[PDB]
Amino acid sequence: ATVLLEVPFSARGDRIPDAVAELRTREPIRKVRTITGAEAWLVSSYALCTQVLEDRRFSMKETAAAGAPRLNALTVPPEVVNNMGNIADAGLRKAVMKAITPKAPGLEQFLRDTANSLLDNLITEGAPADLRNDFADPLATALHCKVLGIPQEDGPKLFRSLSIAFMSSADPIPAAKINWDRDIEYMAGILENPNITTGLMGELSRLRKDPAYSHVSDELFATIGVTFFGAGVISTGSFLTTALISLIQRPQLRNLLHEKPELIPAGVEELLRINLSFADGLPRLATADIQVGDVLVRKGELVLVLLEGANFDPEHFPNPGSIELDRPNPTSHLAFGRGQHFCPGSALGRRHAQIGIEALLKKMPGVDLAVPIDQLVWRTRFQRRIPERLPVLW
Template sequence: MTCPHAAAGSVRTYPFGDRVDLELDPAYAELRAGDPVARVRMPYGGEAWLLTRHADIKKASADPRLSMHAGADRDVPRAAPRGLDSVGLMGMPPESHARLRRLVSRAFTARRVAELRPRITEITHGLIDGLIAEGGPADLVQRLALPLPTAVICEMLGIPNEDRHVFRAFTEALMSSSRYTEQEVAEAAEQYADYLRGYVAERRAHPQDDLLSALIEAHDEGEQLSGNELLMLVGGMLIGGHETTAGQLAGHVALLLRDRSRYEELRARPELVPTAVEELLRVVPLWASVGPTRIATEDVEIGGVTIRAGEAVVYSLASANRDESVFENAGDVVLDRTHNPHIAFGQGPHYCLGAPLARAELQCALEALVTRLPGLRLAVPADELAWHEGMLVRGPVELPVTW
């Protein structure tokens, strides 16, 4: 199912189809070519402007007049059933958002991640040791894609890995678009908040050399964090630190094994892994639909269209990363692509803080797979893979592999 052909300037119904796998609806390419700033009717809240071109999205991402905070605490046109929580990091006032990002950013610098890389590699190889010991077939989602980033972020924050079931339950509820009811989401959120309050209290009484203790110290001594801000930051890092990377890693491996010549290329040339990861980030969609809504606080011109104050703007990073005017052979997977200005991690003030960590985890995982499991292949036909439905993030439910 794709959106019907419509004249430029007409209002289309979004989403255009129900794609949940690695492919994008062809409507995005049609819009990039003929209606790159398109009027769309969103599933919730009314109409918005949809941006699909790389240049327009980069410009919009850096423009402070297009504000997430402006629409955080009211009903706005959006793709998800829930709007941005007004106490969430993305929905905060710009000055508060910048202050909290500065506090946390030190933990995710390229230098800090480089220091963590030996431990990331150790965790990765330990998981693959387990795979090899038990033999195939195995589900790579549960055996590598999910436990790797979960273990890393738990260690960074000082949270026991065995407690991961608590934030897994909340993550699945929060990241759902239709799988869970609002009551189920609220109940999961309260259980999650109770857990974090208890763990923060324990860490306050017994501080350790970890990120959580450092954030508590900033709250208790420097008075830079409120109690709600502390819980929000810790919760956000736990969720963002594992859910998106797990989905991407599973999607990357699925794409490599769907046309196994790609996996063979990396097996023969493992030095290509860092470049290949950038290409996989470009072509593997992370989000099931567009991201959070921005509201124009004054008139803004984007792509030759005047967006009036008060109007909503959404955009597709996945569409931007397939923009033919930026990427040569944009529809192809080119693992040694050298010019690759993708924006998979976003742009501007909301650029993903965890991008260096995600890159390291993806690189370590692929390096280990192609060197230690050269015969890795799907254990089921590619068209039989089941993909998450009713969720904001894309990814296979399971990734059965053998070697």
């Protein structure tokens, strides 16, 4: 006798498990057990993943309902599971979106300058270099401080909340609340700080005192700062780190992008498509009985949308494991999700990775792993797959 298939399958972000293609072929929606002991439906084909993400009756907000089957324990207050809905209801969606585009004057130059400075420092120090802790994550952190309008020197402490905030735990995490409450206090102080006049927080600070927003809560304004910093920094730092591994393990592609940096955007789109950074399926709770393939999902059941299930589906992306720069459907992957919850930072995430990779290939055209790939240490019970250190030489 065996127990019900458990998720997630592997914390390794450098290879997709054979099980994903097996499930997709044989049972593209099937029952699994999560780390909390709950049962859930794991969806692993492009067609079914898109169906679930495009049907609002599969609800993110409702995953926070008391007594629901859970993927993992909340690390934020339950109301924050409705974060984007709260932002939209407050009439703040357009302003938040506008503040986090990569198109602000000087922002891309700041990204380039920061990436180049980080790389110069690594070169000065000598190989081996850690491309996660000393490149990708600081680049993500510096970017988000700039985007938010907050001091660069405040980034590191905010960043250090993230190894706990983005845990994927069976049980509540006391440290997550300590850090959350502290980080909220910090953002509340930022809103009251007359020096903060630029970026997302400068704009929220002005809107907070505009009569058209007088009944939006201070709680929401501070929450937007903490959540956009955290989701943006964890997602961009983790994606760039694992994309760097994908590229290092493809010297022919690495050389092509070095020789023809104008192909970097197409390269980054394929790196997004094959990315294994999301450690868990995207969770939704059914709010009605809904037919998904061969399964009638019942009201109150948990559904997990496996992004790599969709993104490696050969019926949508032929030769799915191969990076191909000339696909006819290159942005149709689900790396940024789909539907109501489509990533609001997608353009910024693309630009962070493009500029990071452009700078790395210019400064370190000979970049390679400095340890056998199996020696990377993959973070466990986390909402992202990332190596603890990424040692390289050049």
